[PDB]
């Protein structure tokens, strides 16, 4: 049934609550956020949480023969490309939390700094490490090391972050540390043989946080060989805990994916081949997840803290806690689109989609193909504030009422009558030729008046257009 599809998607990646995954405890979005910040070190002081902060950053002119505190040499200033990408990563952190970054000239004292290194000791090239950084307030041998980030420029992705997403992710990750974040588990590159087995909680993968070292596939995600460029779901929780949630971000009507008006490279795509991977942070307005240009079958869930399978990837798109996205547009593949308690506009596009508006007054469009419109609660669409199916195709599309039957523990519960008696499960279909609207009334709770109403633009054949 169309309902089963919806049900699967609503129970995709459940977490916390004593769940055990991969032999590890499952942490919730909130627990994971606090754990990633276990060091309690912030730019506002030890254990000073939730205050905004304004930091400076620079790209110092390191001389090749110098040696940094870590004993690395063969240094250099960030190239133009590296500086460009580093500024994009900085911004993505500023988008989610109350952090204000301002660049100071190379030579001015800055909180966060970037530099390349290429040798572990004079004349010896280091082709093994990737990068490292020091958390704020890191006192070592009488001096503060906090905010320094170092990258091994011998690695092509570090040298070319703009064309190699792993390099871009490395910048965001190291900046996470410089801001106060730790790996979600106690492991460190090169320190022995750390593996996913050393994690504290199951959600310690790249699917949930870019501070993690482990493949998103460990929890079932699949990013097709790409790496998120901006803070993921658990990252957002961690950083918002430290410096507060940025309630000024994208407070207008924002579109993510295709036809985006975000002005963020990671929240936008212009082709089916450009896949997106992001965790949405939006502070207001009427927003839309536009995934129309993708030809793959997609699953879009508009509930906060949930995962969607977008553009052919798995668990690549999510919505941060406290965020309300209102509309979603599927692509040409067969999609499953689930709304939330807000009034949503869901469009399936081509292909055979399943649409579920949930609560509130939704407007649904199946588009081309044989689509299914799913209902599971009378209050989903109550008379006087009903859902609207804007393009029903008689004999092609279907209305799924099966849930009410399963819930009533009887298949013959829902039954079409020509006149209401006040009996429960009575369904009544009437057509308005003046407006070309079919009105579907159902009396779920056996009331004097029906408690469920769906207004459908078009005609419905009761003999073929229903799933019960």
């Amino acid at each position: 049934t169309g309902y089963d599809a919806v049900d699967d998607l609503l129970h995709y990646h459940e977490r916390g609550n004593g769940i055990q995954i991969n032999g590890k405890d499952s942490f919730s979005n909130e627990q994971a956020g606090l754990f990633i910040t276990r060091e309690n070190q912030t730019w506002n002081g030890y254990k000073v949480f939730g205050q905004p902060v304004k930091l400076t950053f620079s790209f110092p002119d390191y001389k090749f023969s110098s040696t940094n505190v870590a004993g690395d040499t063969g240094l250099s200033k960030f190239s133009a490309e590296q500086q460009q990408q580093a500024k994009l990563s900085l911004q993505s952190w500023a988008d989610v939390a109350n952090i204000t970054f301002t660049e100071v000239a190379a030579g001015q004292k800055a909180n966060i700094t970037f530099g390349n290194y290429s040798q572990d000791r004079p004349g010896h090239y280091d082709y093994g490490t990737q990068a490292y950084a020091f958390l704020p307030n890191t006192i070592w041998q009488g001096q503060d090391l906090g905010g320094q980030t170092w990258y091994n420029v011998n690695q092509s992705n570090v040298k070319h972050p703009a064309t190699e997403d792993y390099g871009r992710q490395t910048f965001t990750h190291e900046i996470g540390h410089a801001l106060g974040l730790s790996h979600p588990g106690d492991y460190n590159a090169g320190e022995g043989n750390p593996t996913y087995n050393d994690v504290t909680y199951a959600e310690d993968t790249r699917q949930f946080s870019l501070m993690s070292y482990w493949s998103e596939t460990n929890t079932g995600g699949d990013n097709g060989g790409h790496y998120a460029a901006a803070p993921l779901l658990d990252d957002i929780a961690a950083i918002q805990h430290l410096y507060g949630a940025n309630l000024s971000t994208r407070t207008g009507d924002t579109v993510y994916g295709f036809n985006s008006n975000t002005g963020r490279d990671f929240l936008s795509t212009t082709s089916n081949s450009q896949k997106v991977i992001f965790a949405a942070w939006d502070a207001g307005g009427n927003d839309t997840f536009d995934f129309s240009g993708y030809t793959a079958n997609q699953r879009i869930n508009l509930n906060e803290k949930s995962f969607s399978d977008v553009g052919g990837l798995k668990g690549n798109v999510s919505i941060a806690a406290g965020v309300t996205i209102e509309n979603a547009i599927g692509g040409s593949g067969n999609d499953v689109i689930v709304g939330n308690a807000a009034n949503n506009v869901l469009k399936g596009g081509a292909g055979n989609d399943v649409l579920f508006g949930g609560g509130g007054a939704d407007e649904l469009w199946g588009g081309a193909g044989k689509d299914i419109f799913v209902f599971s609660a009378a209050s989903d669409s109550a008379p006087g504030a009903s859902d609207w199916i804007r393009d029903f195709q008689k004999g092609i599309d279907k209305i799924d009422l099966s849930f009410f039957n399963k819930e009533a523990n009887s298949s013959d519960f829902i039954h079409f009558v020509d006149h209401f008696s006040g009996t429960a499960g009575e369904a009544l279909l009437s057509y308005n030729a003046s407006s070309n609207v079919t009105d579907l009334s159902v009396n779920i709770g056996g009331h004097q008046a029906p408690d469920f109403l769906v207004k459908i633009v078009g005609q419905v054949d009761v003999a073929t257009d229903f799933i019960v």
């Binding site: 490292y132 950084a133 690695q155 790996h183 593996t195 596939t217 460990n218 060989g225």
Partner: protein
């Protein structure tokens, strides 16, 4: 602190996928499948026996190795455990990938 991402080049070569006593010889090539994936050569028959599907591509990751379908979607990811890469099936069966 981050892990480095190996190159297709350094991981390419002759590998053996060891399953329920079976062994498939596969060649992880540097031929390009797509933007983030390279080509893999091997006996599909053999591969079907040890994996949920015969993969056609692969790619290194900082923590392991991913065997993919023609469109790049993951068939099986093998984590690096010291000297070998291992993957567990839905039923918990282990599959090992070791460079010959």
């Amino acid at each position: 602190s981050s892990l480095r991402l190996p190159s297709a080049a350094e991981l390419s070569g002759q590998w053996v996928l060891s399953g329920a006593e079976q062994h498939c010889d596969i060649r992880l090539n540097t031929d390009v499948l797509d933007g983030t994936t390279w080509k893999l050569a091997g006996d599909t028959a053999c591969l079907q026996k040890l994996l949920p599907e015969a993969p056609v591509g692969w790619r290194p990751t900082p923590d392991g190795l991913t065997l993919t379908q023609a469109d790049g979607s993951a068939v099986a990811f093998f984590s690096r455990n010291r000297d070998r890469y291992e993957h567990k099936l839905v039923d918990g069966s282990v599959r090992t990938l070791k460079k010959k």
